[PDB]
Amino acid sequence: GLASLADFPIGVAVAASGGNADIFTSSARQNIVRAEFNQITAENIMKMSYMYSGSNFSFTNSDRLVSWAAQNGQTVHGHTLVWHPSYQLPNWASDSNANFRQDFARHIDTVAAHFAGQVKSWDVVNEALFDSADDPDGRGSANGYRQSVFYRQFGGPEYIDEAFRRARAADPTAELYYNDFNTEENGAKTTALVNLVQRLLNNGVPIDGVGFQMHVMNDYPSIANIRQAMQKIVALSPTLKIKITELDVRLNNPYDGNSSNEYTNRNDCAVSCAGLDRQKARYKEIVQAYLEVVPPGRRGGITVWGIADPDSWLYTHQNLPDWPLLFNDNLQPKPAYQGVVEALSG
Numbered sequence: 001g002l003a004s005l006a007d008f009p010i011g012v013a014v015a016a017s018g019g020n021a022d023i024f025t026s027s028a029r030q031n032i033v034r035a036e037f038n039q040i041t042a043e044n045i046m047k048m049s050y051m052y053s054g055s056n057f058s059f060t061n062s063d064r065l066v067s068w069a070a071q072n073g074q075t076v077h078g079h080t081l082v083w084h085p086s087y088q089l090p091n092w093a094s095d096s097n098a099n100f101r102q103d104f105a106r107h108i109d110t111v112a113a114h115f116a117g118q119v120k121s122w123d124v125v126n127e128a129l130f131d132s133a134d135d136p137d138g139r140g141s142a143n144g145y146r147q148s149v150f151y152r153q154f155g156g157p158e159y160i161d162e163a164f165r166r167a168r169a170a171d172p173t174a175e176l177y178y179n180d181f182n183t184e185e186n187g188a189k190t191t192a193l194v195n196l197v198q199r200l201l202n203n204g205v206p207i208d209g210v211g212f213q214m215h216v217m218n219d220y221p222s223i224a225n226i227r228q229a230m231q232k233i234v235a236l237s238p239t240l241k242i243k244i245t246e247l248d249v250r251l252n253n254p255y256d257g258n259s260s261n262e263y264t265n266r267n268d269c270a271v272s273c274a275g276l277d278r279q280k281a282r283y284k285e286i287v288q289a290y291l292e293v294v295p296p297g298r299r300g301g302i303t304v305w306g307i308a309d310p311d312s313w314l315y316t317h318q319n320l321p322d323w324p325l326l327f328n329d330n331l332q333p334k335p336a337y338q339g340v341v342e343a344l345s346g
């Protein structure tokens with residue numbers, strides 16, 4: 001399968017919360033993972049609050065998944081040690097908590113140490129950059145940084161430095177990544193990413209690489225912009241790695257100012273459409289851009305954000321259907337899959 005075609009990780013996000021996509025119950029999905037991939041990311045169950053049961057740490061469910069990976073040919077990318085969304089914040093992660101900075105330290109120290117030797121790499125900090133699409137409380141930018149509870153408590157971006165040093169100290173063997181979305185657009189957020197990373201480098205922070213989530217549409221952003229955005233980060237350092245962490249590709253673009261070019265019906269791309277053919281070319285050009293701009297040393301992996309289309313967080317978006325992944329609803333490989341094969345093989 002796909003992983004045989006590369007000498008860097010080829011990974012997939014897996015579900016473990018019941019429902020049809022849950023990897024523990026779906027032998028069809030288990031079989032695809034073992035045949036095609038050599039790394040998994042937990043789609044959900046390694047987020048912050050999942051490390052607790054009440055006020056105590058609990059690693060039961062995540063240990064099960066990490067063990068499954070070790071038994072079935074997969075390394076693990078840990079997603080994620082620090083991340084703002086309140087749905088996954090531990091209860092300690094609150095402006096009402098006098099013990100914040102200590103509880104933050106305990107979090108990173110405990111979790112990173114717990115998984116030492118079992119988890120290859122981590123998203124140490126995820127989504128530290130401001131994004132208007134992504135500001136439900138209307139906090140606004142602090143010179144490009146998200147004013148998350150971590151930022152507010154530390155009084156600035158120093159939490160990022162601390163998270164990285166603590167992770168490094170707790171598990172010196174893991175590759176440590178900073179992860180974010182929309183940074184492939186090569187606009188304002190990419191600039192903010194440059195600022196963020198440069199500051200970490202200036203401070204001597206043990207960041208090993210940068211993750212681009214790569215939640216793209218078929219025709220936006222342009223591949224030239226994707227390529228240049230990566231180039232800008234590669235140029236910051238002679239050793240900084242680049243990983244594509246959450247790749248998926250939406251046929252439909254509701255943000256292009258043209259509402260006449262959508263596939264509005266689930267049946268539209270059930271079998272064949274211009275969209276699935278473009279999606280093949282889109283996966284292929286992105287895996288090509290990555291290879292062309294990221295030197296081999298420095299390639300930390302490519303991961304797609306789920307196995308089969310109905311598992312995707314983008315299966316429906318903006319009340320429209322989409323088909324974002326490499327396998328279809330019947331778990332058959334799509335043209336997308338072939339696009340990856342062609343890219344990997346040259």
Ligand SMILES: [Ca+2]
Nearest residue numbers: 253254258259
């Ligand atoms: Ca459109």
